Amino acid sequence: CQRVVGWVPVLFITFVVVWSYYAYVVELCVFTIFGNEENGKTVVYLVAFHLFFVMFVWSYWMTIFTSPASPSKEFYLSNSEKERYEKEFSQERQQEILRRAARALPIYTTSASKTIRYCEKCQLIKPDRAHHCSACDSCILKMDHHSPWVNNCVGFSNYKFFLLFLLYSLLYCLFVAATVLEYFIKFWTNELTDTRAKFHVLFLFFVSAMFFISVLSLFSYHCWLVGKNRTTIESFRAPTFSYGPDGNGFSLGCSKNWRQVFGDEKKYWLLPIFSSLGDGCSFPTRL
Amino acid sequence: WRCCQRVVGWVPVLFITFVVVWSYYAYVVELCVFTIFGNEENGKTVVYLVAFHLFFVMFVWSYWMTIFTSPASPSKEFYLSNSEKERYEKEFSQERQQEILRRAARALPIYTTSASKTIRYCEKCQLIKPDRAHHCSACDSCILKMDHHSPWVNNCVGFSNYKFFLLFLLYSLLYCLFVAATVLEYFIKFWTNELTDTRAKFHVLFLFFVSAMFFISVLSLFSYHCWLVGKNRTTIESFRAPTFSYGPDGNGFSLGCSKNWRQVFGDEKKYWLLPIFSSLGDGCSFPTRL
Ligand SMILES: CCCCCCCCCCCCCCCC(=O)SCCNC(=O)CCNC(=O)[C@H](O)C(C)(C)COP(=O)(O)OP(=O)(O)OC[C@H]1O[C@@H](n2cnc3c(N)ncnc32)[C@H](O)[C@@H]1OP(=O)(O)O
Ligand SMILES: [Zn+2]
Ligand SMILES: [Zn+2]
Ligand SMILES: [Zn+2]
Ligand SMILES: [Zn+2]
């Protein structure tokens, strides 16, 4: 169905994280770190590791199973407008049917040719920052991009969950890499030579370091998108307003831009609980 | 104030500087002297050390040039004089203040407008943007034939830097390709324990990975600009085709594949692979297809 093959990237990430939990706790902390009796380190890593581990898997879970938000029923063509639009043959006259409907909706953007943004498949008038996804077969409010590593679209409901998933990916990889670093050296100078545990300790430092540098660019890109209040699509095709194209049409200042996604309640900023302001169908404009 | 912000822009170049200085120490001292030369192969050592230095000097020369070549800014002809800028600041009508820019544009070689048929004007610099020129908020200036603000060089890629930036990507691939190709033979052996220099293990293995990660990364970045040069498009223009008097046209500056490359590298073949300024034009006006 193509759905099944879509669950392959998440199974890979699941096994790599499951392997990292067994490798970091069993092979590294119990066999290696506890094997040389260094006072006060085995416990302080296990409590900190579990703390990073739960935040990583909880944010990753939310990004996967948080269904993407769709436009409300107000943006769908009524039976009167959907009929006349389907039967109208002149492209000029069918545009007026969409334009009159757009006056009753909070729509401030148009196509590149000054055309009312309309989705022929869903038979609805696309709201601002909303785009149709051929994988999800639905319009996604404030669609950022379809992330294949979570088998879901990153939209208005997912965005803050996706960003935290990146951040906790960085800290989980940074913590593992920085803590395994001191013991990755000892197996090479041959202070330790455990045949049963050497192989697991090495990959931890390489897999965590190769994933750290990978998502780090992905994390820096979105820190710059959020400050500018742009989605991944808007960075490549800026939305067109009445006064022309403007890639900063939705910007409200770097401080207020972040709060549009994270909210004003500070107790939900770092937790993967929906705290994004607004409804996803309409967004404050700069002008 | 800005001591924290302006200095943090130099962090990406100091990171690459340390990676390169280390790669020089890792390839010459640890690999060629300690690893390769300890293995009774003085023929491969000297041929590598000179081949490495040839790529190393071309790599750092292009890198330095893309950094310290300041981007081109508009000339005083495009600035609004104190007479024209006075009447514009006082005007409140949108079309009447636009008429001010229209008569001024009849004296400038400008063939592009905005997507909404408006004269490209810059409120911060108080000038009329030349063609292909754009304003950079990081540089706080207008940049002639601006491509993109590449943070890894802490500078704008514009009309004067572009060839240096392109050669900096070319020599990065070759510097990484040469290292990846040469360290490959000795990378496999250390995993089969075929050699054991406790001190050489750390540098030789990191050499292969660091050079392999950078190669595959900049390979896409290098491939994107080779298309831009052939189409005579900047990065900004690949996102939004410019609009001329006859409408939007992504190939409005295209003069053919061969003639577009010479626009950046020049007609003198001796300057093609050298990071010395050889780009055609003045940056304020460019030949159009029509
Ligand atoms: C072994 C040792 C080897 C070492 C070897 C080292 C190798 C070294 C590489 C290492 C690893 C890198 C490999 C991966 C690469 C990355 O990690 S980073 C990828 C970044 N790629 C880029 O191209 C940089 C783009 N960054 C920008 O800021 C661009 O200018 C953007 C995308 C256009 C956005 O700019 P901005 O946010 O608007 O900021 P600003 O400075 O104000 O620029 C504004 C101008 O852009 C224009 N603009 C903005 N948005 C748009 C748009 N959607 N459409 C058209 N125009 C736009 C504005 O209109 C404006 O122009 P005007 O019309 O006003 O005059
Ligand atoms: Zn749709
Ligand atoms: Zn999708
Ligand atoms: Zn400017
Ligand atoms: Zn710049």
CB A244 to CB B201 under 8 A?
no
Is the Cβ–Cβ distance between B163 and B268 less than 8 Å? Answer: no
Method: X-ray
Q: How far apart are CA A123 and CA A139, in angstroms?
A: 10
Nearest to A140 by CA among A124, A149, A150: A124
Q: How far apart are CA A45 and CA A26, in angstroms?
A: 12
Beta bridge partners of A145: A154
Q: How far apart are CA A112 and CA A97, in angstroms?
A: 19
For residue B206, the chain A residue with the least C-alpha distance is A206
Is the Cβ–Cβ distance between B189 and B24 less than 8 Å? Answer: no
Where do we find the tokens 């944010």? A59
A154 phi/psi in degrees, rounded to 5 = -95, 105
| Whole-number Cα distances in Å, A254 to A37, A60, A277, B6 | 49, 26, 15, 18
The structure tokens listed for A232 are 């991944």
Q: Which residues of B9-34 are buried (b: 16+ CB within 10 A; e: fewer)?
A: eeeebeeeeeeeeebeebbbebbbeb
Q: How far apart are CA B42 and CA A278, in angstroms?
A: 70
Interface A-B, measured as beta-carbon pairs within 8 A, has a size of 21
Beta bridge partners of B136: B141
Shortest distance between the Cα of A238 and any Cα of chain B, in A, equals 8
CB B116 to CB A213 under 8 A?
no
Rounded to the nearest 10°, the torsion over CA B220, B225, B226, B230 is 150
Q: Mapping DSSP to helix (H, G, I), strand (E, B) and coil, where does residue A64 land? A: helix
Secondary structure (DSSP) of B207-266: HHHHHHHHHHHHHHHHHHHHHHHHHT--HHHHHS--EETTEE-TTTT---HHHHHHHHH-
Strands (E), chain B: 112-113, 121-122, 127-128, 134-136, 141-143, 148-150, 155-157, 243-244, 247-248
The structure tokens listed for B231 are 């189409």
Strands (E), chain A: 118-119, 124-125, 131-133, 138-140, 145-147, 152-154, 240-241, 244-245
Nearest to A129 by CA among A145, A140, A114: A140
Helix axes B198-231, B11-25, angle to 10 degrees: 130
Question: DSSP state, A271?
Answer: S
Q: Structure resolution in Å?
A: 2.9
The structure tokens listed for B102 are 């229209």
Q: Where are the domains of chain A?
A: 3-70+147-268, 73-126
- Mention every residue, 6+ apart, whose C-beta is less than 8 A from residue A84: A97
Shortest distance between the Cα of B116 and any Cα of chain A, in A, equals 6
Question: DSSP state, B151?
Answer: G
Q: How far apart are CA A287 and CA A252, in angstroms?
A: 9
Is the Cβ–Cβ distance between B286 and B145 less than 8 Å? Answer: yes
Is the Cβ–Cβ distance between A205 and A174 less than 8 Å? Answer: no
Strands (E), B47-146: 112-113, 121-122, 127-128, 134-136, 141-143
Q: How far apart are CA B254 and CA B130, in angstroms?
A: 17
Burial of B44 (0-12, 13-18, 19+ CB in 10 A): middle
Q: Pairing mode, if any, of strands B243-244 and A138-140?
A: unpaired
Ligand nearest to the CA of A151: 3
Which residues approach ligand 1 with their CB closer than 6 A? Answer: A 217, 228, 235, 238, 247; B 16, 19-20, 23, 129, 134-138, 148-149, 152, 172, 176, 210-211, 214, 217-218, 221, 235-236, 239-240
Q: How far apart are CA B255 and CA B263, in angstroms?
A: 9
Name which of A185, A189, A215, A217 to mutate to probe chain B: the one with the most chain B Cβ atoms within 10 A of its Cβ: A189
User: Among A189, A238, A244, whose Cβ lies nearest the Cβ of B116?
Assistant: A244
Nearest to A157 by CA among A68, A262, A228, A219: A68
Secondary structure (DSSP) of A195-246: TTTHHHHHHHHHHHHHHHHHHHHHHHHHHHHHHHT--HHHHHSPPEETTEE-
User: Among A185, A189, A245, whose Cβ lies nearest the Cβ of B115?
Assistant: A245
Helix axes A42-65, A8-22, angle to 10 degrees: 170
The structure tokens listed for B214 are 């950078």
